[PDB]
């Protein structure tokens, strides 16, 4: 009858469907068994290091998680509690970037599915806000534009095609792989309706300098009379700068920052599906993007492009945010610095590679090879593969595409045992190669 | 020292934070607890019937969720089957609408985090195609618009909001909650970007008339030259027709319908976080929509607003595709059909009502008060509420603002016994009304 | 065959059984969703604040529960260490009532399933205690009686009508809600088994000046020469005063106290199925009303109205008792005490409300409607289930028929979090009944 | 500072208390363990054929169990669901008994926590009913009694001597162990509130024929003009006739079977803390024996000796009826009688013993050793423990104190593997016996 064990049963004889959807159900153990294990040919998350999303969360949040895989978040609603959780955590990561609060005020901002969302909203809070202030001075609103560094993330790239708006961006030098603060204040015309800065790039994981292209465009705005924003894109950073590094004006201290996104899913210690946006003000959200439905119960105040969404991550967020509080963060952050001075150290004791990373920043390390003749760093990233390590390889954006870099995230679930063996392995790769 | 239990210690003497992030951190298990416990204040999802989306999953399916938390879905290098379990949900999503496939041609569309995302993506889509097309003939660009039901879900009103385009709306008639496809073909203009027929309206679950907007446009299109294409917002529906009735003609195999959303974690069946966005052909995405990065190890072709995201309920979708089939599905629909006429012959039975949703569509049952004088459908919507019975009451859009109505979704996890003792607490709620002022 | 889903099977097609018991088997998945699907009706323990029977435990305690559900209690013989734990249980709550116990002493008292059969156990030692000695000196026993206050809890009164008793109650007055001392002493004669005080009213949670009632009944006996003994119902109070006010005399150190109840599944911190009874020494019960059964294996010292029961509430004491010590329970009952205060705090900063509960005493809150005219209290406690909290309404006992009250316990597993929540909730429920008839 | 396990700390150097509450608190692991440890000296409950009770359950009523704990049963207003299960229960064993019931009347009876509370309601309401009748005909009603035979459960002893009802037992004849109907209905006089037949007595399983004592009973009903009722002790018997023996009449199908008994932790298959009372008609159970309470949200209608207790056996019971079903309960009952025969046999096969059970009634062997010169039964008993087997042994009742016998219950996880380890470890035990003083 059905006595059969998976494995001894016609079903592991028949390989999953590509195309078709299958006529006839089969057992729901059966179901489990293959699909876990096709499953098994993806890499270990824990062992991706080229991702700087968590992978790993305590116990305990894993039940919170599990308890409320069910909740719907929009239903607000039937889940007052879910929604209100949200709203605090929006309060304490406007706190956090130093909003222009009165303490127990409401915050502006909103959770998303991630930073991709929150720039998008961010971006379009900036184009309307820009067209209405053009339409009122009666000018044009045909050309809006936005000036970012060429290491700029894809999702910028995402919001100006989409959106139709212009991204102008300031190229990379060798040596020189963050923004300049100057070349983009020199970029800003009447069309610009902000410039983007990165708090941690993706490529070096290099803080740009913030508080210099508030202070170059505040000059600007004396001359120009435009009244150009600044939007921080903290998608990691965000949750890194609080605790290793609060003496940096970067945020909301900085006049010209009307807006800040960052991942929650990245150094916000949560599992992937949460992103934030904050406001340095609510003039700085037009209220005609926001939208009042009424039909799953009463009106509620609605800014994001998506609608149903798990409420998992959002209330794992308020976890992590009361259970470490600033000491917790801190505390992982610096085990995370540590180790990236491990790393860091260890590659440069083998005189094989240029740190093309800072000390500091986003805990990671990005380096080149010193000759790259006889062998490419991509042939490295391949080796590593052999040992379950992912380590990507990648050309830097113009004009230094003739830059190749390899690179190393350090999170939270990153131990200093993980560490040491990647230097070892990294070792035995170049020895590999010595010999090809 | 750290022996206190978490009700005997100090930290359930202080409430949780509102406004600023704690200096010290708290024992994980106390934190569990006062988190898990003002969470108790929540709805029971289960006894939510508000809603459309999926409350209920095979203890098997919790397991691979568990088991892919940490899966970033945005890393196709790093995990190639999760990617590959995605495209195989886009091509059996694809023949399930009839798409003009050729058996193991590789379907165009994606995986989102929820209609709302494929809608403005099937919505972009159309703006583009239609710009490029202008763009070629020489004709201006400047006002696009899209037709559209005043039962609209709001998705689309962000989707015209955001990226600025005009939202044509045929307006509602009393006992007529859909959209008419004379009205709304007879809206086209040469700006109209795609008319938006709804499969499953949220407001009485009717199913549009798809096969006669589609007529009617053919042969509008046959005069005005335009090629105004049809894009069906099967967001519920999409996991419905196909099963109980397969003979009914709403998806591609109708030539003008381009584009398709459908939201998995609803009638399919997966825990919120997880929609559908499928393409007739390729010509119907301009490949200029398409991006292809390589900072994470190879070169991917992406096209959403998100990127960054859970992979676990694309995995879920997939689990309950190959695990159900069409027999499971069929069942499962079957099911909750049934459920829906109990209900709705329970609430026949009182006379004290009015159905106003269909006998084929949706399952649910969408019913006005007869003499809405006394008493009005909010107040029986609060009274539920005590017994834990969430049941919405709201009015309908122009013009039928006068006409207000409760709303029952019958999803799979709602069984017979929930069904006949949803109708003794509605009646049990009627009594309590007729002894009051 | 049977690899359909429960929701896809026709089992959730059928409504549960409620008259006959079914023919067939069906599948123990399908059995075990139903029933779980149905019972989510039932209100939320953790917020149902009309009990005083607790509602959480530790999940280490859980699991000796769950290690120990077969576990039959009445088999001494082959579970020796359970009947010991349970021997245990009475000398560490002896003692903790200052019963008159030499080092290590074996105490006199049983187990119970809760106060209930306490009550009746102590009551039924009380007649048998006073027909022996009328009996020796004679005299009548066809007319025995306690004498309580109106206050008295239901069990008393089962006890009075199934054992032949007659209960004299002393009445109570406005702002007056326990049982005055002097007015039960007189009401007391020759026929009197017993004074029965209340340590801790379920109707607003106060202390019977037992000490007062000791100092005058000892007077009266020298008058009288009856030897009319006192019993203490601490239900609740008696896992509270032991730890919050250990100077207050109300227990064994009152000569005339001769026994005490307490309930373990209320402030005992342990899941509902759990009473203790004790007497102050081996004189106060009767050897006769002890049975010695053989059946089993051997002989064993039994005075219950029970036989087999679950062993598992025994434990869970033990558990609680060596794991928590004096400094546990003490952090509890303060933290109750604590949540107590910012829920009074609350109620009064509205002006709305009496607070007819005292400041010492159970963990709990009763308050009256100043002004009960447009509104009752009745109407405030249907609203606050909506939002999923229970609090009860209730008419005091004669002669305060007049008085209607609102009752909320705190207990071990009520936090901050909720008791801020609460005061929250019932201010927006009073305000929805500022804008209506 | 806490990063010691439990055996490398400084809690497993002390004894657990015995006599005095400790002072401080100790972390729950280091609790957990020591009292977990302790327990292991406990018997194996599966491994004790001495009880009745059932030692296992399906994980899926594992869970419903544990989900359940916290659920008071008394807050009926809190858990309505809860109180309706218990109804339901009260119906389908109602009908079970073939009481006189329409469709679909509610029946007349109450969950207990066992037989014994259940047995001492059935008794008061015998009592109670009896009294009226006799103060109606100004008869006294000062002496009241009970019929049964000496193999009378320990349970009618505590009532007739808590309830003051004089118990008058038909004495146990040798190769005779249950009551006489001739003997029990010649002793019914005026006084008799009614005669107690045991369906499946401990001694040996054995059903008394309650057929013929309905049939004496009622000719002497026609002579006496007294209107003696007869009470059905179906403990154990009460889940085991309706599915092997549906042919046996021994239920309401007699007209003076007033009231039954059934334990639901026994042949109920449900843990420990389960049992049920059912009434012939809403007569047999007088209306001021009912009490009705509103202190906790309304009015209830209870008939019980206990008030706070667990739920979850309640919940269990019905789980185990609408899961298992009469097909069910057959199939396991057939089971634990097919083991019967099997243990049965392998002693007989020894030319050992005398087997004082009877083929049918409860699924049980009850054996003497022929010629218990060298050895007795006892030694036997205690030579088994060593293996892990608890078989009990003791002597009859009167008139056959001098009869010893050794019981085996076959219960529902009674496995023929066990079965058979069964009678080669007793052959084992008889050969070490057999060198010996």
Known sequence: VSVHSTFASRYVRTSLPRFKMPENSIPKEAAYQIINDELMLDGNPRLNLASFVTTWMEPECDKLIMSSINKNYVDMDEYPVTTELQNRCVNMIAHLFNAPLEEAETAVGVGTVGSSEAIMLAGLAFKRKWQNKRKAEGKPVDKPNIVTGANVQVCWEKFARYFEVELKEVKLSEGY?????????????????????????TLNGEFEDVKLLNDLLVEKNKETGWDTPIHVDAASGGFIAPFLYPELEWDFRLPLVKSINVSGHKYGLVYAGIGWVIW???EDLPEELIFHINYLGADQPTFTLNFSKGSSQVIAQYYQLIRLGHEGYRNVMENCRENMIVLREGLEKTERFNIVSKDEGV???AFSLKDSSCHTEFEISDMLRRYGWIVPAYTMPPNAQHITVLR??????????????????????????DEL
């Open 177 to 201: 792989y963050v923004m300049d603060p100057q070349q983009a204040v020199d970029m800003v015309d009447e069309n610009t309706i902000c410039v983007a800065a990165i708090l941690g790039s």
């Open 280 to 282: 340095r003000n609510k």
């Open 363 to 365: 805990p990671l390390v």
């Open 408 to 433: 190393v995230v350090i999170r939270e679930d990153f131990s200093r045992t993980l560490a040491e063996r990647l230097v070892i392995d990294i070792e035995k790769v170049m020895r590999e190669l």
